[PDB]
């Protein structure tokens, strides 16, 4: 019955269910980022030579560069039967609040973690902005999640790559004292009561000070049928629908502005609630957040299920055995090179007694002298001179170094190409577009396009706050994947160039060239050229 007990039961079930994959992913991350000699937390280990002769890291660099050269972003397109420009405003909003550095950095982090460990993720958050807002004095920004494998824990009963059917998800935050004070200031918590939760990290490297303060954030999605209100839009509008939970304080201001209720229906929708929790108490209980989905977008590599058990893999898991064997063989061979006596003669002391200085290594003599006679045995026994055998790398060591290197090269071949990895990034971006559309409908101010202009219908309450009024005709555009563009002007320029590339040199070619000049940036000469293009376009009607 206890809220904390239920939340902790769900989290414990997910943690136990997703345990082995998390350990493997963390091992691959540490192996490919810090050191291949995962042998620190160990005893009975003396000081021996341990070299790191990497052969997998260049492959990871190549894959990261190839995936980076091909950016992918959302592309909103109108649905079937809708107006042809039903997605221009949403696309402009997405470009405006996703052109910043944080979005690109988060996407790159997720891609690199996908390539190395197998799973990455990022988050979408809403913030208040007063200087350069996108809409309704609010912005939406994309934030990174580092070590998603151990820091993001999904519902165990999720059978989708993007986890859209997961009903809850917990994100573990780990920080030091200043970070905990920061978090408490941000979320109105008590900085004096240091929180604690499950530690996602592991002590595997002699780091001077690891993070100690843990807390968790629990997202849950509740699908229910709530009450909607059917009004009559004053500007010659068909019955317009709003949600009672949304328009609750402007309930009378709608009538004051001129909205008359026609009927009341029940429409099913999803709502997202966040709780800030520790291992002992719940700080924030059910703070409702915007959107219809969990704002965490996961990105996967090779993903699947084995026996009701989730498995993911990148490019590093299989090469680890060969890499560890190659490192070991090279260390052994370096030991052979170092600690092996050199090739020197074997002498009886009486053979060279008296002529000691001739064999040290100087070059003052033309020959070497040896004693011949012995006073007791008559003559010194004769035996051909023997020399210590030179150091030699064994055939076993050589052949295993070659075989391990060959095996790593053979197995570290993603594809024949990163096509599947780019497809998982694209699927993550499609889910990102879905979540962003839901959040935009929840908080932003979307104008409605009429064929009679963009009519923004909004009203202010008695507390001077503005409540958005969004009709239920909100899913007019679907999600696709296209090139990443910084602005709608850049997107239009690219579209015009693409059309020009396939249009032959005729009147449409002239039209497209003039349009390209019209949609150019402004200096002085290009300003003159664009003015000329505008004049020509207007003159030809």
């Amino acid at each position: 019955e206890n809220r904390l007990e239920s939340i902790l039961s769900r989290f414990d079930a997910d943690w136990t269910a997703s345990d082995e994959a998390r350990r493997e992913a963390k091992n691959d991350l540490f192996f490919s980022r810090v050191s291949q000699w995962d042998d620190w937390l160990s005893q009975y280990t003396t000081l021996q030579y341990r070299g790191q002769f990497d052969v997998v890291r260049p492959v990871v660099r190549k894959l990261v560069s190839e995936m980076r050269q091909n950016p992918i972003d959302v592309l909103y397109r109108p649905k079937d039967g809708a107006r042809p420009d039903a997605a221009d405003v949403l696309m402009g909003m997405y470009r405006t609040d996703m052109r910043h550095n944080t979005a690109k950095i988060a996407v790159n982090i997720a891609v690199r973690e996908q390539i190395e460990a197998g799973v990455g993720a990022w988050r979408l958050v809403t913030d208040y902005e007063d200087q350069s807002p996108t809409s309704n004095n609010q912005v939406i920004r994309r934030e990174p999640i580092h070590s998603a494998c151990s820091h993001v824990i999904w519902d165990s009963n999720s059978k989708l790559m993007d986890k859209s059917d997961a009903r809850h998800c917990t994100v573990i935050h780990s920080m030091s004292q200043n970070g905990w004070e920061d978090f408490a200031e941000k979320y109105d918590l008590d900085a004096d009561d240091i929180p604690s939760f499950q530690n996602p990290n592991d002590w595997v490297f002699p780091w001077l000070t690891q993070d100690t303060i843990q807390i968790a954030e629990f997202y849950e999605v509740v699908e229910k049928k709530e009450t909607a209100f059917i009004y009559q839009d004053p500007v010659t509008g068909e019955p317009v629908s709003y949600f009672k939970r949304d328009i609750k304080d402007v309930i009378d201001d709608l009538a004051d502005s001129g909205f008359i209720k026609i009927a009341e229906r029940q429409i099913k929708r999803r709502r997202v609630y966040k709780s800030i929790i520790t291992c002992t108490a719940v700080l924030k209980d059910k703070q409702l957040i915007a959107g219809e989905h969990i704002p965490i977008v996961p990105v996967f590599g090779e993903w699947g299920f084995v026996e009701d058990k989730e498995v993911y893999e990148g490019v590093v898991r299989l090469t680890k055995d060969g890499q560890r064997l190659r490192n070991m063989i090279m260390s052994f061979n370096a030991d052979i090179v170092a600690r092996t006596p050199k090739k020197k003669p074997f002498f009886w002391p009486e053979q060279i007694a008296g002529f000691e200085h001739m064999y040290d290594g100087n070059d003052d003599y033309p020959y070497y002298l040896l004693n011949r006679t012995d006073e007791n045995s008559g003559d010194l026994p004769t035996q051909p001179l023997a020399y210590y055998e030179n150091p030699e790398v064994p055939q076993a060591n050589a052949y295993m170094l070659e075989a391990a290197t060959s095996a790593v090269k053979e197995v570290a071949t993603l594809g024949v190409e990163t096509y599947v990895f780019q497809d998982n990034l694209a699927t993550a971006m499609r889910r990102d577009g879905e979540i962003y559309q839901s959040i935009v409908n929840d908080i932003y101010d979307v104008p409605r396009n009429v064929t009679i202009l963009m009519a923004e219908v909004v009203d202010l309450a008695t507390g001077e706050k503005q409540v958005l009024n969004d009709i239920r005709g909100r899913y007019e555009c679907y999600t696709d994947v296209g090139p990443s563009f910084q602005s709608m002007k850049q997107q239009n320029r690219a579209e015009i160039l693409e059309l020009l590339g396939k249009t032959p040199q005729g009147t449409p070619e002239y039209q497209l060239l003039l349009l390209q000049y019209f949609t150019l940036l402004d200096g002085k000469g290009v300003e003159m050229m664009r003015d000329y293009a505008n004049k020509q376009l207007i003159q030809m009607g």
Binding site: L41, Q43, I194, S196, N199, D202, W203, Q210, T212
Partner: protein
Amino acid sequence: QRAYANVNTSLADAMAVNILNVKDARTNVFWADDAIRIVSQPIPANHELFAGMKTTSFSIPDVGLNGIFATQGDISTLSGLCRIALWYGVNATRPEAIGVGLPGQTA
């Protein structure tokens, strides 16, 4: 070697030692911050103990230390064991900088 001298003279045969604590008193402790030092180490993963035990990190609040939360199960008797191990050592690297205040040390 003379650059490390800290006393004016050596111990010359029969010199009288004076015991500076003559009555029991709860101590007051003053030090330089870099004199007392704490060294913390995690339990090795493949120790002789913790043989068939699954181990995870366990952050101790207040003091800035971590430890090993180890756990094992038994199938004969359907039971289990937990062990919160904290491996640390306190060292006084500057005893000449650490001090002790004894009030009321009358004869």
